[PDB]
Amino acid sequence: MVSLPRMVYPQSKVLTPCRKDVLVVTPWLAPIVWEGTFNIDILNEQFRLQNTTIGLTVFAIKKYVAFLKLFLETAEKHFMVGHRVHYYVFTDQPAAVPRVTLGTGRQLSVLEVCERRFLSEVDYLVCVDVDMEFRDHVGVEILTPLFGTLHPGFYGSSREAFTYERRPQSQAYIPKDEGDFYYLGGFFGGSVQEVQRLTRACHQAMMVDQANGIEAVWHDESHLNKYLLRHKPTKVLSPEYLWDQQLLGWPAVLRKLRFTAVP
Ligand SMILES: [Hg+2]
Ligand SMILES: [Hg+2]
Ligand SMILES: [Hg+2]
Ligand SMILES: [Hg+2]
């Protein structure tokens, strides 16, 4: 709760939008994080003064353990650098986890495949897929109670085109006239409490679907979209945060490609 120290930075012009090519705030007043919308120095101050600890979770089973080295090494270069980080690697091959050199204040836990642990060890949880690599800054600008990430292939599409689950028989059902954005199942997070609420909710919904003999079109992702539609995220990350340059190239609208799929 302490006050920020004296800081010197350029003034923001009230009569000058920061980005004139994209939407930077949702209808429920949640910021949409694009390069240029934030001053990382101010945000780093706020979060360091709180001695914020960020948990980063990834599941690496079978052949996916092969992606851990690059994932962890690039995260060390771009993920929450300067802040306390705790990586949680869930895997069926504990011995196959690469020994990556970590910066100070950063640790890694290998869990073989304990929620109570999270509440006690980190302030925020970030959940992503392992077959990725960081290519640019991914920092505290994303931290908030609950956040979703705009899917790179649908940020410019009409909602009718969103690949939401369209069957009323599914708990993830979302009609053609509903929906704000199409979020990625591979990059979401927020406070431990909000994240556990989301996963707990999606777990129950998927069980209901299973019992009813139905499986959502895009599984976990379909349910995450239903959850975020009914519980608006406090921050929305732009496609900068999960991109696939091989399939989508590098649009002018993207000033940075921070987290990407591995070819
Ligand atoms: Hg998680
Ligand atoms: Hg859900
Ligand atoms: Hg689930
Ligand atoms: Hg989910």
Swiss-Prot record:
Binding positions for Mn(2+) per the UniProt entry: 129, 131
Comment on bound cofactor: Binds 1 Mn(2+) ion per subunit.
Molecular function terms, GO-annotated: antigen binding; fucosylgalactoside 3-alpha-galactosyltransferase activity; glycoprotein-fucosylgalactoside alpha-N-acetylgalactosaminyltransferase activity; manganese ion binding; nucleotide binding
Assigned keywords, A-Z: Blood group antigen, Glycoprotein, Glycosyltransferase, Golgi apparatus, Manganese, Membrane, Metal-binding, Secreted, Signal-anchor, Transferase, Transmembrane, Transmembrane helix
Signal peptide start and end residues: none
Recorded GO CC terms: extracellular region; Golgi apparatus; Golgi cisterna membrane; Golgi membrane; vesicle
Effect of residue 141 to D: In allele B106
Glycosylation: residue positions: 51
EC number: 2.4.1.40, 2.4.1.37
The protein's required cofactors: Mn(2+)
Annotated positions binding UDP-N-acetyl-alpha-D-galactosamine: 59-61, 64, 129-131
Membrane topology per record: Single-pass type II membrane protein
Effect of residue 152 to S: Altered substrate specificity in group B transferase
Ligand binding (an alpha-L-fucosyl-(1->2)-beta-D-galactosyl derivative): 151, 163, 221, 244
Expression by tissue: Expressed at high levels in testis. Also expressed in pancreas, uterus and lung and salivary gland.
Post-translational note: The soluble form derives from the membrane form by proteolytic processing.
Residue ranges annotated as Lumenal topological domain: 2-263
Known outcome of mutating residue 153 to S: In allele Bw08
Entry comment, domain topic: The conserved DXD motif is involved in cofactor binding. The manganese ion interacts with the beta-phosphate group of UDP and may also have a role in catalysis.
Family membership noted in the UniProt record: Belongs to the glycosyltransferase 6 family.
Function: This protein is the basis of the ABO blood group system. The histo-blood group ABO involves three carbohydrate antigens: A, B, and H. A, B, and AB individuals express a glycosyltransferase activity that converts the H antigen to the A antigen (by addition of UDP-GalNAc) or to the B antigen (by addition of UDP-Gal), whereas O individuals lack such activity.
Name recorded for this polypeptide: Histo-blood group ABO system transferase
Species this protein is from: Homo sapiens
Gene behind the chain: ABO
